[model samples]
Structure formats: structure tokens, C-alpha cells
Target: PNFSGNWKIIRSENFEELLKVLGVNVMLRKIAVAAASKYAVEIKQEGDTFYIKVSTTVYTTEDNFKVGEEFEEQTVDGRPCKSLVKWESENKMVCEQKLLKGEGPKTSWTKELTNDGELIETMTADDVVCTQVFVRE
Candidate 1:
């Protein structure tokens, strides 16, 4: 899948509760907390290498990986996890995360580029399903 590009956060649905599910003991839970509209995400991909830089008013977190290999992942909120991203198509992918240390249920996220070329990311776990929609940047 070639979901590699820069994206701007336009909005997110039901994220404050999602943070409660993901656990943010420190601070800056407000973005994923008080407002999900206050963040932006950038992605880069080349062949088998991929990376993301998530930046907000409070902090920035980064994740890097190669397809087919499990990698250390620290979610933007600081939860440590082991993750694997599997491609389903040239424009779609799914990430399965096994929580290692933090407040969360085992989660999976699916990322897809809309027909209009925007990015849609959905995170699911337990009874929580959070959606973050981004625009081309």
C-alpha cells in the first residue's frame, strides 16, 4: 500500500474518550483530549520503509517501520506497544497493536485514502472506535 503523504488534521470524532481508553497520565491529553481538531500528522514512505511524525501544540511523537516486521511502537500518547502493519491494497493498510505497557485494550487501526484523496484513520479497541480525518497538505 502506498499511503505515504503529508496530512493535516481537519477533525477527529470521539477522541477524548478515546484518550481515556488509551491512557494519558502526564499532560497534553487535551489535543487527543479537550480537542481533536488541534493536531496534524505527516507521513513518509519509500519502498519498504515508512515513518510518521505526529505533532501537536504539546509534543511530537515519531514511529518508523518496515512492512512485514514487528516494530517497537509508542503511540502518540505514550503507550508502548508492539505493532505490525499489513497492507490490504495499494491505498489501504491495517495496523495491529498488542499493548505492552499502558492503559489500553489491544487495538487495531486502519488507514485508507479516500476517493477524494483525503486520509481517514480509524482506531478500534474494546468498545471504543475513534476516527481521525485528515486533508491533503
Candidate 2:
């Protein structure tokens, strides 16, 4: 299966609380809450590069990288990082974000397409976690 299309955010678990645990401010948290109604994701693989773009009215973050390669990533909330992405298997990718700013703890994200055809995303930091499942658009 190819993870090369758009996905719609159909459901989430503890997403807002996850943001709060990450120390997100009330303003952006407010944006995130209101923007959840129209969230979408696009994952593109062009040649040796991969791009993961998340769009919402609150903010949009796009991280592009290559398998086993590292790049500089500027997050939507303005934190910057030295990021690395690696494929642990044929269908699972892990992203490691090394904080280059004042962000507390580094974050790692795992993305996988479930056997049932849903896009599954899990993000975690020191003590925060978020899980989301997206359906194909």
C-alpha cells in the first residue's frame, strides 16, 4: 500500500489535552480547538524525498525529509529542530525531532497505515501523547 494521498482527520483521542501537556498557550489552543473541524493531512513521496503536510486553520506544519536522513524543521508553533525520519518497516515511519529551541523535551512521531486502511499517527514527548486516526480523502 502506498501512503501517498490526502487524509482527513476523522477522529482524535486526547489531542487537545496533548497540546496542553506540551505547554501550548491558550490562544493557539483555542485555535486548535476551533480548527479541528477542518483538519487534513497530505503525505507525499516524490523521488527520494517525503513531505508530510498538516493543514488546519490554527496552523500548518510541513516536514519534508528522506529515509534515514536529517534536516532542519521549523514547526508551526515556531519551534525549530534538527529532524530525522526513518522507516522502521515497509509501512511505518518514525520522526525524531531534536529541539533546537526552548521547547522542553524532544518529540518523536510515528506514522503508519493500519491494515484496515486508516492512517494512524501517534506523537509523544516527555509526558504527553496524542493519537489520531485519519481516513483517506
Candidate 3:
């Protein structure tokens, strides 16, 4: 599947717990959870490079990378991380991130573009899992 389009989140599960496991503070986690449904993702691909933009009512972030390349990222909570994006399968892609500074739990995001035409994003950190479903816009 070519994941080169705009997607809007329809629902989310366990996002708050995932944030908690990632060591995000209570107040910001609550705000993030509350605004979860307002999240949107835009993806663009050019040759071997991919550009992704994630936006929410509270914050927006842009990242660009090629498969298997390591890059830098800044979380909405103001944390810095080193990350890598890879294609796990024909329709599945995953991103692995580790904090660049202090002891934060390692995180991974697996995003699958399903046969049913939905994007299923699963995030894991410290054994906590969060799933969010998105549809093309």
C-alpha cells in the first residue's frame, strides 16, 4: 500500500496509558489524550525519501526520512529522540525511537495500511500499547 496521503484519526485506545509508560507527566498526557481524536497525518513520498507531518489540536510536527535511515525527532512533550523508520512488510511500516537524553522507555510504532482502507497505528512503550485508527481524507 502506498501511504502517501492525508489521514485523520477516528478513534484511539490506551493512548493515555502509553504516554504514562513513556514517562510523560500527568497534565500533558491528559491534554494529549483529550485531543487525540483531532489528530491528522499527512504523508508524501519522493523517490527514496518520505515526508510525514503529524498534527493535532495541541501541536504539529514534521519528519522526513528514508527507509532504514536514522533521524532525530522531538516529541510533543518536548523530549528529544533518535529514531529509525523501516518497512516491515509490503503494507506495514514501523518506527523505533529512543530518548536522546535521559532514561525514557524505548518506543515503537507500527503502522499498517489495511485491506479495508484504514490506517491502523499501534504504539508500544514499556509494555503499554496504544492503537489509533485513521481513514483517508
Candidate 4:
């Protein structure tokens, strides 16, 4: 259930829909979908602090925060936000992200490691949802 490692995406669904709900331009969404093969996530943990890096051919972002502390962060699409990460169980965690200003859908992610050792990341923005499965690399 440890999430600190390198993972490469193996499958995904509704990713482009999630991007559209986040206000990504159509052109960018097209590029993101086309570059999906490059999607990967890297994580490092020290005590209660976690460092995460999310990357694809189109964009890359990194953030660090304590498990229960709210921190300044930016979304993969570069939207500034306040983020909070919390453990739901020994084997799962959830993150909530809110736009720093104006208006945006409530976005959250639930990440769990399956008994089969695959990482399942469930992303949500209001009602839109995307699921991505990753294998340890």
C-alpha cells in the first residue's frame, strides 16, 4: 500500500473529460490525449511529508506536503490551488484541491494500491470522473 515509488500509467478512462471540466482548452486536451502514453507519477515520502511528481509529454508538476496539512499547489494544468491530502486508511489516501479564487469545480483524487500491486487513481471534479491504472516501474 506504500505509494512512494515510480509508476507508469497502463490504462485510463475519461481523462479528456476531466480536463474539459477543469476548463482546459480543446487544443490542449487534444494534445494531452495524444500524449497519454507518456503519463507517469513519481513519489517520495519522508515521515509524514510526501513529495509527488506528475508528468506527461504535455506538462509536469511537482508538490510536497505533510499528509494532513493544506498547502499551496498548482494543478497539472497550472491552475493555482489549495490542496490537502489525508490518509483514508493504511492502503488508501485522498486529496482535495480548491481553486485559489474565482470559480471552479471541486476536485479530488482517491488513490489506492490494489492487492494485485496496481495503483488506481480515481480523479473527480464535481460529477466528472476519470480512472487511471498504473503499474510500478
Which candidate number maximizes lDDT? Answer: 4
Q: Residues 26-107, candidate 4, lDDT per residue (tens digit)?
A: 9999888878767899988777788889888767878778888999987645678898989888778899998898777888
How should the candidates be ordered by lDDT, best one leading?
4, 3, 2, 1
lDDT of 3 by residue, 58-90 (tens): 778888888889999864345888888888888
Per-residue lDDT over 10-69 for candidate 1, one digit per residue giving the tens place of the 0 to 100 score: 878867666677666536566445545667778888976888887777777788888789
Query: Please, what is the TM-score per model?
Result: 0.81, 0.84, 0.89, 0.89
* Prediction 2 TM-score vs. true: 0.84
Higher TM-score: candidate 2 or 4? 4
- Pairs in clash, predicted candidate 2: none
Q: Mind giving the per-residue lDDT tens digits that candidate 2 earns over 2-119?
A: 7889999888776677677677988888777668767789998765588788888766788777877889975424577787888888788888888786656657888887889999
> Which parts of model 1 have CA positions greater than 4 angstroms off?
23-31, 101-104
lDDT of 3 at 45: 76
lDDT winner, 1 or 2:
2
How well does candidate 3 match the true structure in TM-score terms?
Answer: 0.89
